[PDB]
């Protein structure tokens with residue numbers, strides 16, 4: 001389904017990649033995206049899919065564009081254009097310096113000191129979930145751990161009832177991996193309609209939860225408006241309900257196939273933070289982008305005002321120019337180069353929370369369930385979009401080889 005090639009785009013730069021359904025998806029989603037890094041593909045290409053847009057395919061270009069907000073604006077950061085135009089989340093839809101005071105507030109509610117404060121609850125929940133699954137000798141990891149672990153931590157931090165999880169999970173899915181069942185705008189509005197009365201309640205009677213803190217925060221010497229609070233809280237919900245969930249599944253899928261990697265971490269758990277970084281590189285999963293603020297020649301390519309450019313965070317660390325043998329998982333790489341949490345002013349506000357959840361998962365799962373595998377004859381399917389993911393991950397193990405703590 002191909003949009004007519006714009007007059008300014010030369011034909012040798014055309015490469016019709018579909019970010020929502022890449023042709024090589026059966027090989028794994030990262031593998032499917034890595035077709036953009038084969039020798040037949042220029043550094044910067046135009047796809048006619050999804051309305052037509054640029055794709056930067058090398059880490060150097062991706063990093064440069066994320067730094068240059070003057071030319072590459074976050075005002076319209078999603079493909080297709082309809083989604084990007086409807087996108088108004090805070091701080092992501094803002095460029096510097098406007099994003100700054102909102103980002104500071106975001107750091108207050110999902111940043112480091114908050115992680116350090118909730119760390120006991122994070123540890124508690126991982127141990128509880130895993131111990132409950134342990135005697136079963138099987139699970140569907142996506143529904144049984146990857147979802148409830150980070151999502152329940154988020155709902156705890158946000159002071160939201162766990163019964164709202166299915167609905168919010170559906171809406172966030174529609175924004176990052178659309179079904180066709182609803183436009184981005186309709187999904188976004190449903191999320192907003194959920195938040196609107198909660199924000200008003202918590203402006204009236206403030207709590208100490210993330211929503212209360214955002215809704216009662218200060219911007220530019222004045223109170224945050226109910227609208228601004230809604231737009232930021234909406235982003236926090238999307239940010240809290242999708243990426244870590246899907247990332248955990250890619251990592252656990254890998255570990256299920258790699259006993260030697262499991263033992264490295266069990267025997268020398270001080271290597272776990274580096275392993276976290278390497279898995280974040282290899283199983284990177286986000287791809288959003290920017291819109292051109294003006295005509296601009298970038299690496300020899302003429303970009304036009306209003307052109308969209310996908311700058312896949314996923315691709316920087318898979319670029320062989322950034323990491324040798326990029327598809328190999330090597331916990332001992334001297335430098336794990338990646339932009340998995342993004343780059344520039346919008347570098348993920350939740351990255352500390354994400355890392356903690358990952359490192360807790362690695363340690364606590366491998367302690368109790370050191371030996372496990374993918375269920376016999378199970379076909380693991382990945383999905384692709386703004387955030388890529390694992391559809392289902394059936395795991396099996398012999399309970400006799402497990403340990404309670």
Ligand code: HEM
Pocket residue numbers: 074077090091092093099103106110235236237239240243244247285286288289313340341342343345346347348349350351353354
């Ligand atoms: C492995 C897990 C995660 C990954 C890979 C990831 C990735 C990213 C990326 C690539 C961006 C930048 C998007 C852009 O530049 O347009 C971003 C932004 C953001 N993320 Fe995450 N993230 C993760 C976990 C989390 C968590 C747990 C939260 C908690 C709510 C969170 C909240 C946010 C927020 C609020 C922003 C916006 C920052 C800004 O625009 O200034 N993220 N994330």
Ligand SMILES: CC1(C)[C@@H]2CC[C@@]1(C)C(=O)C2
Pocket residue numbers: 089092176238239243286287288386387
């Ligand atoms: C691209 C993102 C990962 C980043 C945080 C959530 C997300 C889906 C956004 O809308 C901005």
Ligand SMILES: [C-]#N
Pocket residue numbers: 238239240242243244348350
């Ligand atoms: C961020 N998600």
Ligand SMILES: [K+]
Pocket residue numbers: 036037038041042043044057058
């Ligand atoms: K390329």
Ligand SMILES: [K+]
Pocket residue numbers: 075076077084085086087088093
């Ligand atoms: K917009």
